[PDB]
Amino acid sequence: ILSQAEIDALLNDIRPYDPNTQRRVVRERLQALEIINERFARQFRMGLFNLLRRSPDITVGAIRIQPYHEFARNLPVPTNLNLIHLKPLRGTGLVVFSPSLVFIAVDNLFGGDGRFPTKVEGREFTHTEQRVINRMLKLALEGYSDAWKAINPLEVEYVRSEMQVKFTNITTSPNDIVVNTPFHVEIGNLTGEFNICLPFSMIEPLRELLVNPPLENSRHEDQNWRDNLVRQVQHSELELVANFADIPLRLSQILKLKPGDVLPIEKPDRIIAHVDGVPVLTSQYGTVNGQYALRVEHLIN
Template sequence: RIQKYSDFERNLPVPSNLNMVGLKPLRGISLFTFDPNLVFLIIDSLFGGHGRYSTRIEGRDFTVTEQRIILRLLEHTLDCYCSSWEPVYKIEAEYIRSEMHTKFASISSGNELVVVTSFNIEFGAQGGNLNVCLPYSMIEPVRDLLIRPLQDTSGDAIDQRWTQQLTRQVRSAEVDLTADFVKIDTTVRQLLSLKVNDVLPIDMPEKIITHVDNVPIFEGTYGTFNSKYAVRVQKFLTTTEPDFHKAKLHDRSKQS
C-alpha cells in the first residue's frame, strides 16, 4: 500500500527492529522492520522454547546474541526479497545498519509517500509482521516495469523482457547427454549364472544415437579426439513433443 511515511512510522510498535538497507542500483534507502513479538518468538524457538514468548518487551533492548540472530534472519529475508525481484529488475541488497527507534532510522520526510508491503508470519497461535518500506521516489524509475505485467494481459502483448529471461534460463539448464554403444539381449537365467571372467560377445555399431531423457537427439560416429573418446555429429534427429511424453512415461515405468 502507498501511504505517508509519517503514518507508517506512527503504526510501528515500540520498540521495533528497524533495518536500513540499500537496494542497488535503486537510489535511496529502504526499511525492513520486524515486530518485536516476532523477533522474540523466533529467538525463543531457536533456543528450544515453544514459541510462546510472553515476557514484557517494552523498554528493553536486544542483546548481542539476539542481534546476531536478527541479522541472520535479515540476511535470509534479503536473499528471498532480491530473488523475487530478479524476473523484473535485478537488485542487490546492501545492509547499512539497524536501529530500534524510528527517529534514528528515518529514510524519508514525514510527508513523502512510501510503498509498504506487509507479511504476517505466524508461529502457532502467535506471530508478527515483517514490513518492507520503500520510498516512492526509489521505485519510480522502475514503475513501468512493475505494472507492465498487469497491463499486458492480451495474447498479442508479449513482454520481450520476460521472454528473453525465460530463454536464457532454458538455455543455461543442464542436461545429461547419453550415448548408448551397445545393447545385449539376455535372460534372467543367463544373468544370474554370470561369473567373474565370463565373456559377453558384442557387435559394435558403426553409428550411435545420443539421447536426452530417452529422447533421441542426433546420430553420429565415435572415435577419439585430443586423446579422449568423442562422438562426431552426423545428423540431427527430429524431436517432437510426443517423444518427450513417451520418455517421461518410460522413466516412470522404470521407477515403479
Template sequence: MFEKEYACPSPPTRKQAKKELRQAQSCAEQHAHLQASSGSPFDTVQRRLLEGEHLKGLEMINQNFAGRFRRALFGLMQRRTDISAEAILIQPYREFIAQLRPPASLNLVNLKPLRGNTLFAFTPGLIFTALDTLFGGIGRLPDTQEREFTPAENRVIDRLLKMMLQAYGDAWLRLHPLEPEYITAETSYLFTGFSDGEMVIISPFRVAIGGMQGEFAIIFSQATLEPLHEMLSKPLPGHICRDQGQWRQNLARQLQGTELELIARFADLPLYLSQVMVLRRGDILPIPRPDRDRLTAYVDGVPVFLGSYGSLNGQYALRVEHVINEGINQLNNKDISHE
C-alpha cells in the first residue's frame, strides 16, 4: 500500500506529449497577440521610435551643426561637399557596434559640463574619402580588420575631429554652452567605456565629398543627456532659429566669392589605347561637329547650365538658355530671405 501511494507517475505517451506541446504553443501565440494589440510599454522598438521622435531640440542642433561643419569641410577639401543629419536612433550600444565596419576611428570627447564621455565615431568611408580627396587615391576601402591608423591617416582624422568639435560647440552655444575636450582615440569598441547593453542616443550623419561618401556618428549615453531631456525634447527657441537663418544668409554671400571651373563638353573622341600610345607632337585629332545644338556646362562634374554654342567678339561662346541646377539661384542676393 505504501509503495503504491508514492509510486512515480508513468511517463506521458507520445500522443499526450504532442497534445501538451500544441496547447503550450497556442497559449504562447495568444499571449503574444494580446501584447501586440495592447501596445505593451516593454516594446523596445516602439519605445526607441517614440523617444527618437521626441528629441526635436537635438534634431535642430544636428541640423545647425551639419551646416557649420559643411562650411568648414568645404574650405578644407575645396570640393563639392554635402552633409546631411539622419534620424536620431536610440538603441543598445552593441547594436550600433554590430553595424560599424572596421577599421573605424572611435574618438572619446568630454563635453563639459555634461557628465560622462561622448563618442565621435568615424567610419572607414569618411576617413578614406577625406584622405583620397586631399592626397589622391582610388577611393577603395582597405580590408575590414581592426588596425592602427598610419600617421597620414591620423593627421586627417585629427583635422576632421578638430573642425567637427568646433562646429559642434558652436551649434550648442546659444542653447547650452559646451566645451568639447578631446580625451583619446580607439580603434576597438571594447575600450570606449560603453557597455554592450547600455542604451545610447545616436546622431548619424552622412558626408558626400565629390563623388565619394562616408558616415560618422555622435553617440551619447542616455544618462549623459538626461539632465537636458526636457530642453532637447522641445523645438529650439525662436531667437536661435533666427540665428540659423542669418548664418545661412552669411554662408550664401561668402559662397558667391568662390572660384569655380565651368566646363562645357563640346565633343567626345573615343580612342583605343593603342591609338593613344602612338600619338606624337603635331598629330591632328579631327573633332566632329556636334550633332546637337545645345551643350551642357558642368561644375565639378555636376550639370548646371544648358546652352547653345557660337562665337562672340571673335571668341567661342556659350549662351545660357536653361539653368539645370536650381540651387544656384539660392546664392543670388535677390533670393536671400531677410526675415
C-alpha cells in the first residue's frame, strides 16, 4: 500500500499588516487546556475500553492554533463532523471523527478480527454506523464534561451531525482563529484519530483561567495563606509623592528658563498624593516640626 509520497516518486522581522487576520491570538501556552485534554483522553480511553472490550491507546497531540480556513483545509474528506455546545459559553464546538476510527469501532463492536481494514469509499455512514458514532460521541462528551469540571463546570450538548465542513458554520469568518486539539487512537494494529476544535471566541472569556497550569487548592488552608500573605505585604514600603501643581508650557520656554524666572501656576485648593504616579488621596499642605506636612482630607476609593 503506497503512500502519497511513494506514489509521486513512482509516477515521476518586518511584515505588512493585513486587517483580515484577527490578530487576537494567544501566544501564551494554554496549560490548563492541556491538562483538561489529558484528563479527557484518559476518561475516554476507559470508555472505549468498556465499549469495545479492547484496550485503546490515546495520544494527545500538540494544541495547534490556526485560522479556521486552515483547519478546514486540513480535514480529510469525507468525515464525520459533530456540532456540540459548551454551555454556558456561547458558540458551537466540533467533534471530528475520522472514518478510520469509525470503521475500527464498527469492526470491534461487530466481532471484526481487525485483519481486514475497511478502505473509505467516500460513501455516507449507514444508520447502524450512525448509531455507533452516536454512542462514541456520547462517551466522548461525557468524558469532556467530566474533565472540564475541575477547572470550569461546563455542560456539553450535541446539536447535529454533518459530513462537510461548509455546513458547520461554526465561525463567522473563514479567517477566525480556532483552537484544535488532535488525538491519535491506537487499537491493536489499527490506528485512528479524532479532533476537538473550539473557536477561540468561545474560550476567550476564560483566557486567564486557561493560561496558568492550576490545581490542588483549598478553602481554609488557602484562607489562612492569603491572610498571612496580606499581613506580610502590609510591612512593605512605598514612595509617597505629592505634586504641588501642573504647568502647561512648551520646550522653547524651558530653554529660556534662567535663575529668577517666575512661572505662574494655578493655586490648588487640594494637593493630590501619587504613589508611583497613581493618586491615592487628596490633602492640604502645611508645615509641622519644620517640615512640609500634608493634612489628609479624603482617600481615593
